[PDB]
Structure formats: C-alpha cells, structure tokens
Write a protein that binds this ligand. Structure first.
Ligand code: MQM
Ligand code: MQM
Lengths: 446, 446
C-alpha cells in the first residue's frame, strides 16, 4: 500500500479521495490554492501545502509547484482526480520521471486516447463498434470529403481530433455546407488546441449518452462495471446520471462490456477508465474514452458495491485486480443529481458565503460534498459544489428517495440548481426513463 | 584503490559495476528499494542497505538515504551508474561536500554539460564542430527570432537548454509557426525543468546518431575510444547500438576523436564521457555531452579491449588511464540489442514474473542482465531487462552471432522485444548498414 499521496485536486473529488486514503491507512497531502485554505479535505488532511494564489494556472495546473510539494512532504504518489491535470500526458510523464506513482494510466495511453482519431483507430482494431466515419483525418480534397459524407449518409458531423466538451464540432446536412464547415472546424481547433486535425462521423439525431466503467491493473486483467446513462444534460454539462441505463438488457450489457474489457487488454490500460458511447436503435457507437475517474463514478459504486477510488489506489500500489468479472453483479438502481452554485433558470454562476447548510439523510442516500455552513464557494473554480446520490432496489425507489433528499437539502446565501433537480425528478418522461441527450434543452425551451 | 563503494543504481548496470568492483578487490554496498531485495547484484554484494520503498523518489533518487548508506557502511565513493542521479550536479556536490568521492566529473563540469547552451559555447570555443544555431538563448523579440531563423535557414529546431531525451523539441519549417513553436517549447521547459531557456539549431532531416567515448584522468591524460552508431531507435529509445560506425574511415575517426580529447583537456574533464554528434553527408555536428557511463558502453569495450567501468574506478582512486591513445586500436565489430520487457503492439512496459530463462553462449557472445528464472520484473522502473552484445572480426560476423544468440535467448512469462530484434538483424538495409535515425519508425510504419 502507498505510504503517502498528494491529492492534486480540490472540492468534492479531493474529499472523496481523502476518505479512500484514510480507509486504506494512506497518509494524505492536501495541496491547495491560497483561496482554498478552508476546503473540508484540507482541514482533514495529515499535511497541507499552499501551492500558489487563487487562479488555477498558478496553483492546480502549476506542474512544478505540485511536484515540489510531493518532494518536500516525502509523498510516493499523486492522484490527479478529474479535470485539471488528470488527462495531461506531459504531467503523467513528469510524475513518473520525478520517481512518483501516477494514479492513472501510462502517459502514452493518455496520449493515444486523448487524440480522438488515434483512439477511434485503436477501438475499431480492438472490436469496439464505432460511429460510421472517415476512419482517419480529413484532407483538403473536397471530392474525397464529399465521397466520405455520401458513404456515411447525411447528416454528418466534423470534430477536432484534439477537441472535447462539445467545443470544435459542426453538424453538416448537405454538400453546399461541407467545405466551409470543415474549414471553420479546422480554424477553431488550430486556435484552441494548436491542432487543426479533424474527422467525420455520421450524425445521430436522437441518441442516449451511455458509458461503460472499466478497471484494469495494467498486468493483463480488465473488468467492466456495467453502464451509466448521462443523457440528462444541458449545453454539454451533465445534470443527472443513473446506473444501470434503462432498457439495457443483461445480454447487451455483456456484449458491450466484454468488448470494452478486451480493448483495455489490447491498449495496456491501467486504472479506472470510461468508454463513452452513443446508444440509438439498440446499437452502441464509441465516441471517446476518459482516462481518469469521472464525476458520476458513485452511481456505479452503489449498484456494484465496488469502491472505484480504493481500486485505483490498490492498482497504483501494484496489486492485481482481486475482483473477477463473474463476481461483478448489477444490483438495484442509483441516480446522481449534480448540485451547482448557479441560478436554476439563467445559470449565472453564484459563488459566495453559504449562510445555512443541511445535508439530506436516510436509507440509500449518499451525499458527496465539501460544503458546510460558513464556507465561501469561491468565484475562481467550477460551479459544481456537491453530488446527491440515491440508491434503491429499483429505479422508482431511487427516484422517490431523490425527491425526498432534494426536499431536505438546505443551501442558503447562493443560488443552486436544487429546484431544477426537483423539476427533473417530477418530469413524467424522466420517470418513464430513456429520454435522449436533447430532452432537457427541449423541456427548458418550453 | 577505493576500499568500498556504494552502487547507487539497480538492474543490469548495478551488476556490471559489482563485477568491476570485485575484479579490483573493492568492497560493494548494494543500496536497494524494498521491491529490489532479490536483484542478482544485491544477493552478490558484500553489504546491503534497504534505502526506501519501491518508488524511485523514495529510493534511487533519495539523496539523504544514499549518502546515509555510504556513512553507515564506511564507504568512500558512490557510483551513480546511468539515469537516476548520474547527471544531477546538486547530488554530485552534496556527495563531495559530505566527503565521499563521486565517480564522475566535477559537479561544475556536470552543470556545464547539462546546460546545452553553455556546453555548445564551450565545445565551439575548443574547436569541436557544432550545428549552425543561435549561439545563445532566444529572447521574446520575434523580429530577432525571425532574423536568426533566416540566417540559419529553415528548417530549424527549437530545443530546451535544460532539455533531455528528445522532450520539448519543435521543428519549424516557416515564419508562420515560429512564435507558437518557441512559446510552446518554453512552456514545456518551464513545467519540466523550471528553466524556460531555449535555443535554435539548423534541423538536419536524415542524420545518423554517432557518439564518441572519451576517458580523462586527474593526471592530464585524455583519450578517445572510437565511436558508436545509435541510429536504430524508436521515439528517442535506442534499440540497437554498434561500434565502430559503418562507413567512418580511420581519418574521420582520428579527426573527430582528437577534437573531443582536446575539448576534455580545455574544460578539465575527468572520468568517462560521451560526445553526441549528428553525422550527415560526411560531416559531424556536436549536439550534447553525457557526463556518465552509458547503456551502450559494452560495444566500445569489445572493439578496444578497455574495461570502461574499471577505468572509472581507477581514475576516481587517483590512478592514471591504464592505456595511452597510441595503444587504443579499433579491432573487429560489436552489436548490442537492448532486451525490453515490452508489449510488441503498444510498446508499453510489460512487467511480471519470468517462468523460464536461458541465456545464449558462444565465442563473441556477451550477456549483460540481472534476470533469472523466477525473477519478477517490477512495474516501478524502466522496461530494459538485459543487453545482448555480439563481437566478430567484422560486422557480418557480429550480426551472424547476434541472430544465433537471439534464437537461444529464452524469456518466458513476460512479453519481450526479442522477435523485433530478430527482425532488425534480418533487415537488408541494416545488413548493408548506415541507416538513419528515422529508419526503424519507417520499417514499423509499413
Ligand atoms: N463526450 C461527448 C462529445 C461532446 C458531445 N458529443 C456528441 N457527439 C456526437 N457525435 C455523433 N456522431 N452523433 C451525435 C453526437 C452527440 C453528441 C452529444 C451532444 Cl451534441 C450533446 C450532449 C451529449 C452528446 Cl453525447 C461528443
Ligand atoms: N540526445 C539527442 C537529442 C534527442 C534527439 N536529438 C536530435 N537533435 C537534432 N538536432 C538537429 N539540429 N537536427 C536533428 C536532430 C535530430 C535528433 C534526433 C531525433 Cl529527432 C531522434 C533520434 C535521434 C536524434 Cl539524434 C537531440
């Protein structure tokens, strides 16, 4: 087991990682910006280092300051959480070169899967179904670009290979728009990612966003831990996630899960990861892989009993997976509501002092948050302040508990999306299940 | 002679140093991580000290623990091998300040040659031919940077002064890319080396990588021991090295060797060192100097009869070089194949337990490895598990012996590059000789 780790992150995920460390008897080093001195996990950590002033560029993205803190505290490993440096291949490489364990994949694996064209080629080669596409970057030959759109069938979508979070994407519905759409996607990718490489996929009009959790030890063993439906979203921000996905049979789960586990073996994957799919008319189509733990990991933990952060720490310590595939059982249902310091109607961010705070309780109710009464949500970071996860023996019980938990949750002094989450839980289409990625934008547009 | 030394390394190079020590009657102290208790050299050493847990930051890079092990055993000297702390000037300084001998040059010389800008200025002043370049660091005036690129002539390459292992470097083919290329190379150097200093060179499209071995003692003697060709490489990892370099005449060898030896006298060099050159269209161009023994030192030993590790130990004890320049004769040819625990499709490390092991034998066959049947290759260190070195009276006989030795080498239980090495020895272009630094990536791309 790792003697001591740096938690290279903040907010709810830093606290999540701290708890996993304490359960395993791992010493914690909380690195923080000067604005994050009062984070709950900093106040609970064995040691603390202030790594710079508020802005992330000076603190949480500051590679020399983080490595320096890990050196002076005698830590042996760094957990990057999600966001910040978690998919920064140069960071992973520097951590290993400075003689630390990186709690995540090999740097070369982060590079492979962070380049969307090379990632799709690897997945297609492994037997993972992908979206009908260019299967390679687009050139400047518009005869060949039109021939790819024709074979695929309009509508199509142009994506940046260095792209992500929905930025650097353009839908094309006929030939007249194709040349200008490719040119503009290139220019946007070059200006943002210093990488003008683009590819083409068939555009699916009304898919669900369904993702497969994996764990691999990097020693030849890989398992899948069912799927999450992340379709309830607004402007490429997930709002509700659930596990398992409604309408997914055991035979479908097994089909796509086995192809994801086999892909992990083929690419030498190490640690926690997520395969993202479009799911439409009963078919899965790979779009991209997250090479890190994700925000919504708790819904998978509730339905499998697997602690994904502890597994990340065991794998990083060099332990092979102890869990075999035949020991992974989907049981019951879990829903996660993201709690954001933003206006429930305008989504204007709402940093500020929380003047009153009460967390929900009950059977099947899990609260993941650093916030407390008197804590100031700072203006410098993300709006996501907490995650409310409710489990039941079925989806209806999970939703019933979430409605009750949302009604107990008090956060005064800032705006939150708690009232939006209550509306979503009361929505008849959500209660039926299986709504598509466009549903929440449509409901709010009315 | 040195009574007792610490071997501040692991794996094959630790065993290589242990043998040199035993031949000279030097007592050995094997410092090891808790994962390396069963290394062959640890089991053969006179004394052992466990200096910390598996991760390199707390063991092989742990300066206090290594010096403390030298103090508690009564050792007089520390041999740093290659990698880890071998090029760490602060380490060399601390070793000398604590009153131990560092088996290497003066700390000041390590600092001079680790600053690529300062090293090039010293070599150019001494009469060593260098690449046409900025001859100084680039500032933030892009009018001056464009004028330097114009004077050199595109294509050019931007390099970190604190740089290493090909990381950060950017090729620039016109003015449009120059500003962003300089900015990105700086940011990468600052994040990795906390040193944002960069310089510019003419980019040579298809060079060979040719390096000159030197030895200098504290009595004023400096000699060259011919050259190695290190061109057969993939993503800045050497795969095959050979000595001498094919197509290098005795007149060229003498020309560049004499300039390297003279540079050693000018800068007060002491110990083993390597001058790295680009060789293209019959001309040498210095890029950088290694102030350490290197992985590929054995091919130079086979063609000269000189034991480079024993020379390192004699020099540090205050003895003159055991041979003069007129006594150094290139005789025959040697090839080295690096044996790696790596996956053939991902090229990631493939650590794990060796279940069956057989080393090759015969005339001209030299096997440099710590591995044995039942030995576990740990995940925490680099993938290179051995070196197979074959000597013949000519290049054809060296290659023939390597093909035979590769066919006898058994390493079961883990994936290895043995099959790749067999393919390289059967390659018609390699058999002809003189292939450039890009050849192996081109062969594998097909
Ligand atoms: N990580 C998901 C990235 C960002 C959004 N995305 C999508 N790609 C797609 N690619 C094809 N060919 N077809 C449909 C897609 C629909 C989306 C999409 C959108 Cl637009 C909004 C919310 C969620 C998703 Cl998954 C790719
Ligand atoms: N130790 C050698 C560093 C890393 C590789 N290198 C190179 N520098 C160079 N500098 C100029 N002006 N021109 C060409 C160069 C080509 C290389 C190079 C590369 Cl890219 C791959 C493998 C081997 C070598 Cl030598 C510098």
């Amino acid at each position: 087991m790792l003697d001591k780790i740096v938690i290279a992150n903040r907010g709810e995920i830093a606290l999540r990682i701290l708890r996993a460390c304490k359960e395993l008897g791992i010493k914690t080093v909380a690195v923080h910006s000067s604005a994050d001195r009062d984070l709950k996990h900093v106040l609970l950590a064995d040691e603390t280092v202030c790594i710079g002033p508020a802005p992330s560029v000076k603190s949480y993205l500051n590679i020399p300051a983080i490595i320096s803190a890990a050196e002076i505290t005698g830590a042996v490993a760094i957990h990057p959480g999600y966001g910040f440096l978690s998919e920064n291949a140069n960071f992973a490489e520097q951590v290993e070169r400075s003689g630390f364990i990186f709690i995540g994949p090999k740097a070369e694996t982060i590079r492979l899967m962070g380049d969307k064209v090379s990632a799709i080629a690897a997945m297609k080669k492994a037997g993972v179904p992908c979206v009908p596409g260019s299967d390679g970057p687009l050139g400047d030959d518009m005869d060949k670009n039109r021939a790819i759109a024709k074979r695929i069938g309009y509508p199509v979508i142009i994506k940046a290979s260095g792209g992500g979070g929905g930025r650097g994407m353009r839908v094309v519905r006929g030939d007249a728009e194709l040349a200008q759409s490719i040119s503009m996607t290139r220019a946007e990718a070059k200006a943002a990612f210093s990488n003008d490489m683009v590819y083409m996929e068939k555009y699916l009009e009304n898919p669900r966003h369904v993702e497969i959790q994996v764990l691999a030890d990097g020693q030849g063993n890989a398992i899948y831990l069912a799927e999450r439906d992340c379709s309830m979203q607004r402007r490429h921000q997930k709002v509700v996630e659930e596990a398992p996905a409604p309408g997914i049979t055991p035979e479908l789960r097994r089909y796509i899960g086995e192809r994801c586990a086999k892909a992990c073996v083929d690419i030498g994957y190490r640690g926690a990861g997520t395969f993202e799919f479009l799911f439409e008319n009963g078919e899965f189509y790979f779009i991209e892989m997250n090479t890190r733990i994700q925000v919504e990991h708790p819904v998978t933990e509730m339905i499998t009993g697997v602690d994904l952060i502890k597994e990340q720490l065991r794998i990083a310590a060099g332990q092979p997976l102890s869990i075999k595939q035949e020991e992974v059982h989907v049981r019951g249902h879990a829903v996660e509501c993201r709690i954001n310091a933003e206006d429930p109607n305008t989504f204007l961010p709402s940093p500020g002092k929380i003047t009153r705070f009460h967390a929900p309780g009950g059977f099947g109710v899990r609260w993941e948050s650093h916030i407390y009464a008197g804590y100031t949500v700072p203006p410098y970071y993300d709006s996501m302040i907490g995650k409310l996860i409710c489990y039941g023996e079925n989806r209806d019980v999970a939703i019933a508990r979430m409605k009750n938990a949302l009604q107990e949750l008090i956060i005064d002094g800032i705006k939150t999306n708690v009232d939006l989450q209550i509306r979503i839980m009361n929505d008849e289409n959500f209660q039926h299940g299986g709504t598509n990625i466009h549903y929440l934008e449509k409901k709010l547009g009315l």
